[PDB]
């Protein structure tokens, strides 16, 4: 069995550095070319960067957008390929994944992908709001979460009582570097004066939990 | 570069359907076009190599054909692991590229959406700002046109949209729409209105409130 392994993602300021690990196992490493292919949502997949087989000087290649920026090396005796990135730029944020081309043809086996973030933004929790269920069958309710970073927060419901119909959407990047989501229910209306509904949010990064009951105005 | 179009962007696929889709090049690329699969929270798996051939493992129901600039994949009969993003990439020359990718998304019938306004809560408002959220409940699909007027003008710029991944269970998505004004902004204006198009309602629904009523 292949594997590739990923390490060393995090968050990073701009003009910050930080050095990517990937650990092979499974094929004769020393003969293969390791590459550095990354994914974000604006960009897709790209090719960021390969080193190939001693066998051939063990040269180096770039994609033109990182060249030098970033730099390829292995280590054979680790079964090892890195990523050192510096001078790093927002738009260089995204997942990077490690990956074996055979030979100058197929991307043939990937790892699990390592997340760069890279923003000038400080590290929040985030503050939570009721959105109550209107005072007009199927009521609607929730809370919103503003004004974190980084992601991810976690919201469950009646502390994991109360799942189905629960919609926790994606957070959006604000135009502050900070994000904001909402999470919803809905219940049926009858159960508004009989139900309590709190949304329990967790921000690992800033160590906030928060729990927000939410009632008819 | 290279740069490989692929369309479409979004292909609905009802289950046991033959369904293909489309990857051309910029340029000629002879048969060096590679195909993968990207399930939701996975990595890129390889598919099919070199246009037409087949990966040990990979499922006879895929089949990739093409030459020169465009190429399909097809997949006869659909099934529900097949639901992910599918990129193709040319090795022709150098840099290696890939496509935009395309969604495979699951196809039923149309539901429209429930409509729901929030005000600001009292709570925000004394923090010095003003989120105004209309939720679009189990639609599909997942086009939408949600408009936001206040005092009967219509907003540009100040709203932000989410939608949730497709719901394992109905299919459908929900949608999220997030109008941020301003305490003082907010204040200005007494009616806040939310109005919905989609392929589900006979005609657009609009919520609405005054500001600082109930």
């Known amino acids: 069995e292949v594997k590739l392994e990923e390490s060393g993602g995090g968050l990073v300021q701009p003009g910050g550095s930080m050095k990517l690990s990937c650990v092979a196992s499974?094929?004769?490493?020393?003969?293969?070319?390791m590459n550095w292919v990354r994914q974000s949502p604006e960009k897709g997949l790209e090719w960021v960067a390969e080193?190939?087989?001693?066998?051939?000087?063990?040269?180096?290649h770039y994609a033109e957008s990182v060249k030098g920026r970033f730099t390829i090396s292995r280590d054979d005796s680790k079964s090892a390929v890195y990523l050192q990135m510096t001078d790093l730029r927002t738009e260089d944020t995204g997942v990077y994944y490690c990956?074996?081309?055979?030979?100058?043809?197929?991307?043939?086996?990937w790892g699990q992908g390592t997340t760069l973030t890279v923003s000038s933004a400080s590290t929040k929790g985030p503050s939570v709001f009721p959105l109550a269920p209107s005072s007009k069958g199927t009521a609607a309710l929730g809370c919103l979460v503003k004004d974190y970073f980084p992601e991810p927060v976690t919201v469950s419901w009646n502390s994991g009582a109360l799942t189905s119909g629960v919609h926790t959407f994606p957070a959006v990047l604000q135009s502050s570097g900070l994000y904001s989501l909402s999470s919803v229910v809905t219940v049926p209306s009858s159960s508004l004066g009989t139900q309590t509904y709190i949304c329990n949010v967790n921000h690992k990064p800033s160590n906030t939990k928060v729990d927000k009951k939410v009632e008819p105005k | 570069d290279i740069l490989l179009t692929q369309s479409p962007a979004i292909l609905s696929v009802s289950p046991g359907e033959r369904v293909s889709f489309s990857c051309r090049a910029s340029?000629?690329?002879?048969?060096?076009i590679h195909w993968y699969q990207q399930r939701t929270n996975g990595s890129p798996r390889l598919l099919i190599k070199?246009?037409?051939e087949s990966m040990s493992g990979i499922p006879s129901r895929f089949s990739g054909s093409g030459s020169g600039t465009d190429f399909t994949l097809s997949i006869n009969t659909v099934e529900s692991e097949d639901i992910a993003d599918y990129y193709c990439?040319?090795?022709?020359?150098?840099?290696?590229?890939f496509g935009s990718g395309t969604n495979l998304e699951v196809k039923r019938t149309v539901a429209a959406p429930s409509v729901f306004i929030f005000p600001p809560s009292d709570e925000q408002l004394k923090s010095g700002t003003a989120s105004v959220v209309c939720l679009l409940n189990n639609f599909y699909p997942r086009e939408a046109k949600v408009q936001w007027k206040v005092d009967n003008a219509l907003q540009s710029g100040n709203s932000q949209e989410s939608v949730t991944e497709q719901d394992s269970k109905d299919s459908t998505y929900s949608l999220s729409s997030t109008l941020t004004l301003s305490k003082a902004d907010y204040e200005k204006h007494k009616v806040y209105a939310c109005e919905v198009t989609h392929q589900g309602l006979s005609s657009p629904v609009t919520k609405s409130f005054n500001r600082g009523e109930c």
């Open positions: 990956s074996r081309n055979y030979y100058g043809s197929t991307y043939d086996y």
């Open positions: 499974g094929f004769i490493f020393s003969n293969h070319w």
């Open positions: 080193i190939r087989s001693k066998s051939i000087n063990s040269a180096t």
């Open positions: 340029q000629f690329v002879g048969s060096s």
């Open positions: 070199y246009a037409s």
């Open positions: 990439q040319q090795s022709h020359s150098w840099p290696f590229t």
